[PDB]
A paper describes a structure:
Caudovirales, the taxonomic order for the tailed double-stranded DNA bacteriophages, is characterized by the presence of a tail—a host cell attachment organelle that is connected to the genome-containing spherical or elongated capsid via a neck. We describe cryo-EM structures of the neck, the neck-capsid and neck-tail junctions, and capsid of the [name]. The tail to capsid junction involves a symmetry mismatch that is bridged by the neck, and is therefore crucial for the assembly of tailed phage. The extensive network of disulfide bonds within and between neck, collar, capsid and tail provides an exceptional structural stability to Milano.
The 15-fold, 12-fold and 3-fold symmetrized maps of the neck were used to build atomic models of the collar, portal, and neck devoid of capsid (portal + neck 1 + neck 2 + tail terminator + collar), respectively. The Milano collar is made up of four rings of [name] pentadecamers (15 × [name]). Domain 1 (residues 1–69, 167–230) forms the wall of the collar, and we thus named it the wall domain (W domain), whereas domain 2 (residues 70–166) decorates the collar wall, and we named it the decorating domain (D domain). Four collar rings are stacked and stabilized by complementary electrostatic charges on the interacting surfaces of their W domains. The collar of Milano is structurally distinct from that of T4 and XM1 bacteriophage. In contrast, the Milano collar consists of four rings (4 x [name]) surrounding the whole neck and displaying no fibers or spike-like structures.
Residue numbers in the entry:
A (entry chain 2), B (entry chain Y), C (entry chain m), D (entry chain l), E (entry chain n), F (entry chain 1): 1 to 13, 21 to 230
The structure:
């Protein structure tokens, strides 16, 4: 768990935005202590109006494309895993499904040549993912299983670094913001992303005090 | 039970208005001891002319709308639960009826898709509520069952924080005001409301001494 | 017997909801002392309008399915015990009927291969259960014996953690709530469930004071 | 006599199951004091619905097989003692009948080579056992003497560790369970068995409170 | 929170006006302690007749113009985002709507080419802003939604540095002035503005003592 | 028993993955203490959703092939031990059956020339292995004895380094993961394997915190 203390905007105490190291596949937790800034502003503390933004400062575009499939409940799904690796050069394709990042409500039998069968778990209808690795390069395959009636919609293909939709909170009693920071298994080591956090305090009549800071998430491998 | 002692207006002993923590769904009790202020004013003590006012200092507008239905006595009532959640984004709707806040004189069978049947209890005609939770966000559905003749009127859709119409009292013998403070199940944690209390003492000829104070009700979750 | 004291809602004295350890198969007893909250509210104490709700915070879906059978009075019942274990992988099936959780008004002779004979006790018509263990994983088989005339209805397949329908009580004389907490033999160790209790006090004119708390039931093995 | 106090399920005070040392041939007595658990549950104390189960955690399969014979009343019985020791290797067979574990209503004259004559006691018809030791390894021979009319049935070949069918009792006046624990003379030193006890208390209306614990019986030699 | 102590005008203890660092988008709080000047003037302390003035000492004129639109309640509003960037040179226009400074009661879907749709939030009539960034340079777009009857007036296009209309106060009990200092998201880093504060004390007959000071607000980026 | 403490992901304190020495034939135990990482994440501790993966970083392909045979219950089984050693060069074949790794429910009489007789233990039907050593190089022979009816399936030929299917556990009370690490007798000294462990903590609402680490298992001989 990371713990940061914010700069208190007094006119007093290498880059601008502080650093967060991350490993592909992890889901860590970050705590930010606004006490130094929001305590002198004697009021009602923090509020749940935080806003986050992720932007890449170094990306290294991915090699293998992601893909989306669709199936009804109970019916076995097939698909290919070879049109997802447009290769520039000449080489062979060691298709691989890592057991750490396999599916969640199904099973996949990787074939001999870029083929795989996803038998969805019986009595289940939702969305399911798994992360393949075509020759070292990792991507994800997203399958949505329908409840036999119409058709399911299409989920947004998880990004390398993300901040879960609603797992954030603030205790106005001690001025501490908690949020989760998850790294996809397809994040390439060496990249750098930037997270900007806009947090509002509140004065005792309910007006607003805004505070902005950033963090530099550097995707490392091996910790 | 909260117990507050009022400031005695002598010229002597972070915000202005003191604090009251509240949890969604509770109904607590508050006691205020005017002894320090109204005892030196040797007279006939307090009177039952208290006035309350609720105002929000932080609200976080609700996501799901509330709704009103109507039915005659004995006839089963249907309705929908999907036009009450205008969603900005793309997501699914896990309609839920909490058993803690179910109906009071009926039964509701939540369907598969935002549908529900409220069979009113036999030999009963009044108003009945229940609190649904469309994907975490809570609202209320109000149904009024008519005694088969004309039509019932329309109740005012309980607010997040309220002070029951008539459950207040004052013992002029010890200068203590009692009132109840109820929090709706739809109050969003982190909000802050402000309650202003205007209490009149009385002098021994029947003239008036007014006293005003506030309390800051901060809707917390988990106590 | 667990004994909890409730927080008195004064504005004064790791998770939110306190903890209850449980062992699969037990049936324990819990006592909650509302004295700290309901005594200052000088009135008629607690009432028998408690409401409970169980929700899982970690479930670990079961491997072996449960099953339901039916038989008339006196006639011996057969059934299979092999279509209740859809296995992903390749392995053998050591069908087992634990003597601690055998039937109650019958006898079962487990066969060599997933077969069993439930001879219902003579002159008896009701419902009867027993808990099998197909290769470590436990489920229940429910049989209903009919009184030879029509057909019996179908009971609801006991859940991992439950609170018996009517074994709850409150002594308004000392503000203490008693209830029973039972754990099915199929509860998987390591899971966590959450119990929410909504208890109403009453004021001396019969109005209501609601109080809500939770408890985190963590299914442990070996105590 | 062993005396155990049970853990009271309060959320308070190397393996899970406590230990019982046992010596081959003994028959000891065990007392369990449920006072710490069943006294707060003010009710009608314990009931005589205890259930036991024995399972091996280490067995060391026996070398010499057991055997069953049959004879009518008064007629002398012969048998062999050499087809009961399938030996892997080459060695000689020192057949021995220990005087501590001889027969009970007969006499046996061990021959020179694995032969023996069991002359049943005159005017007696029942079942009779004796424990031989073919080269250190112990087994039992069971003979049933018939009352000259038909044929006697076949008894179940006593296990290494057992809990006698009906010698158990509970005093609801002090919450103490008594049971007997017997070890066969053929139990191999160093083994470990596990005994699980399921004891029910009862509430004052007759409902049930279940309690489960285990004990690890470690077959030692020499105490 | 900034805290300044004023010079006491005794004839005793690089630029003239002290310094305040500011970051684009923030809203901070400033406290000025007139105790050193207004305490010797034994009287009735400070009064709420403070006057502020903002003047730029370095501005760096903006590149992209701001804009104003108008719409009635409920009707979706369109507009362009390309006539707001008169470019001197040849380059492309990466239109961007930052999520930190998006709208407040609507939603905007930025198109492919400088187009955007602002669907106002249902049941809402007021003014709404959002800050776009045409190729690094930031400006604001102001939309006013009318309550279907006539037409709304036109708000004054928030300046880079401002002092909120009425959030200022003075405690005559300790001679401390509080005011808020907000920085627009379009303030260009490196600029310098000057704030002049004219504060009046009061003598015990109600006459006046004026005091003037300045502060140099230097718009920095990254704190 | 190995004991590792995990790195706590704070941004603070030759290869990446730590080291585990192993000896062919052993079965050791490993303990990992997640306290440093999962304790600050005040929640419900670890869960039983660990995932392991073994991959070789140096293998040294085996010389002698493994083999599979089949027999019914009670019938003696023959087989050869010479087509399992395709030799490149010219040399003789000192067939050997180590007594440390002999069979478990049978006996094998190694012949003069690569022949052997496996007489299965009477009254036994399962799978049985033994490890031969054709001229220093070790492999395994797997025999499955059928219960005379149909045919048994075919077990998966144990790998050099493995992690037993279900002998893993986690005590959420002290944040410690236990698992077993077994090394086959055919592991070649000097090889290196890599074990990756993916462990999930859980927050107090039941969401997830993932943690990944590796260990480098270096097959040594003589400790």
């Amino acid at each position: 768990m990371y713990f940061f203390s914010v700069d208190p905007r007094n006119g007093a105490s290498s880059c601008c935005c502080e650093s967060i190291s991350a490993r592909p596949g992890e889901v860590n937790g970050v705590m930010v202590s606004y006490a130094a800034w929001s305590a002198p502003l004697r009021g009602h503390g923090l509020t749940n109006k935080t806003t986050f933004e992720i932007d890449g400062v170094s990306v290294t575009p991915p090699k293998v494309s992601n893909a989306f499939g669709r199936t009804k409940v109970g019916v076995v799904f097939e698909g290919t895993l070879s049109d997802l690796f447009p290769n520039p050069e000449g080489e062979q394709v060691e298709y691989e499904i890592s057991e750490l990042n396999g599916p969640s409500n199904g099973v996949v039998e990787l074939g001999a040549n870029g083929a795989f069968t996803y038998t969805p778990g019986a009595l289940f209808t939702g969305v399911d993912r798994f992360w393949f690795s075509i020759n070292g390069n990792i991507g994800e395959y997203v399958i949505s299983v329908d409840p036999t009636t119409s058709e399911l919609p299409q989920p947004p293909f998880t990004t390398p670094v993300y901040v879960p939709a609603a797992r954030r909170s603030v205790d106005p009693r001690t001025h501490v913001l908690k949020f989760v920071l998850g790294v996809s298994p397809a994040a390439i080591p060496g990249d750098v992303y930037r997270l900007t956090v806009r947090q509002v305090a509140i004065d005792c009549d309910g007006n607003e005090f805004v505070h902005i800071s950033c963090y530099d998430i550097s995707i490392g491998s091996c910790g």
